[PDB]
From a paper:
Loading of MHC-I molecules with peptide by the catalytic chaperone tapasin in the peptide loading complex plays a critical role in antigen presentation and immune recognition. Tapasin, a key component of the PLC, is a 48 kDa transmembrane glycoprotein that bridges the TAP transporter and MHC-I to facilitate peptide loading. Mechanistic insight has been hampered by the lack of detailed structural information concerning tapasin–MHC-I. We present here crystal structures of human tapasin complexed with the MHC-I molecule HLA-B*44:05, and with each of two anti-tapasin antibodies.
Consistent with prior immunoprecipitation data, PaSta1 and PaSta2 clearly bind to distinct sites on tapasin when evaluated with purified proteins by SPR.
Residue numbers in the entry:
A (entry chain L): 1 to 217
B (entry chain H): 1 to 216
The structure:
Amino acid sequence: DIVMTQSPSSLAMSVGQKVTLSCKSSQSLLNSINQKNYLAWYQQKPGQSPKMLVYFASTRESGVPDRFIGSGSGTDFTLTISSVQAEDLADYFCQQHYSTPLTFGAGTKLELKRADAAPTVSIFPPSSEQLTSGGASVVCFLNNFYPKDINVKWKIDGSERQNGVLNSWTDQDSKDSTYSMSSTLTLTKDEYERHNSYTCEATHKTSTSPIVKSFNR
Amino acid sequence: QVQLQQSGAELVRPGTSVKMSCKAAGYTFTNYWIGWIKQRPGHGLEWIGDIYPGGGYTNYNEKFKVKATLTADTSSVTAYMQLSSLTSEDSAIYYCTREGNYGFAYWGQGTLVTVSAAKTTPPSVYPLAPGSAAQTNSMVTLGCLVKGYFPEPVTVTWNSGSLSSGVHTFPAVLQSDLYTLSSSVTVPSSTWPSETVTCNVAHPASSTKVDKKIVP
């Protein structure tokens, strides 16, 4: 019934300065009587259960620092963190407690700001034992780039297809705060022997020219 | 203090049913509502329904009226959710919460449910060498490709865990109803192929262990 639109998707600001999150409601969450906006902000650390931060759209939960300020009314609501720390890395949800069914927002994820780092691209041809038992799968790796925004494109000596292209993105590193990604070209041994060049391109903000790594069969 | 303890993970098959628990210890159990939340990768959080272990018992979401029946035991503190007609899109983490006037504020540990018809199969691991025709500059990166296993994770280490610097393991990806992932490690060219580098993969489901060296 009620839709909760959280904004933005995921911001990555450095520690020390204040950040803000917005939450729009498809209809007013303010009760006429007992005038209180039935909206709550929750916080969920990476790989854990969500913890409520703010309830009734303005008041904090006991045990939460006063840096988490919740405001807003009607349909627009805001949650600000005045001094971001390492203990604030999580994703945050706004939830309306006014109508049934109860609905959440998609959630805004908090990352750490960093400098741009080009990916380390390295392709790998299929193994010997993989061919004797099964087909052929090419492997491409993209290691330690910032930010997470990246795209991979294969090419088979002129041709190109998305069939058999399974990718895998990691999360932000808990040490150097970088992102990694893998890409596989699952084929069979049959149609693998009729092509020569197999390449794995990228597209990152660091270089105007993509990072290209190829190999001949 | 109040606390909600949920049942362990449930790896089951499609079409069948699943019932989980949620023990409520630390307060008057029959005096508060118990809500159920679903968190599925890619679809955020969803509310399934609440149950009051007193008089007026349950209240269900619209899309969760045929599936996910709710029951409570006022005698021994527990809250149950009975899922039915399990399809692949029911794989998620389910939390039980103690609902209140302004929200939940008290959550459970969580129960991860996974549904699939894939038979428990051990993985097949393949070394990933850069190839003789290459321009290996200083650091050389090697890989260990793990394909065709089910279920759970696979624990992958390099040289029995002695080599952990520059190691990147990627989350598993389902393919042909079987999981697949890979791992990468960067070592100096002065060490490889001068010294051997092995990836050790363990599948605790099928209880297998495979050590395969990376050869040029």
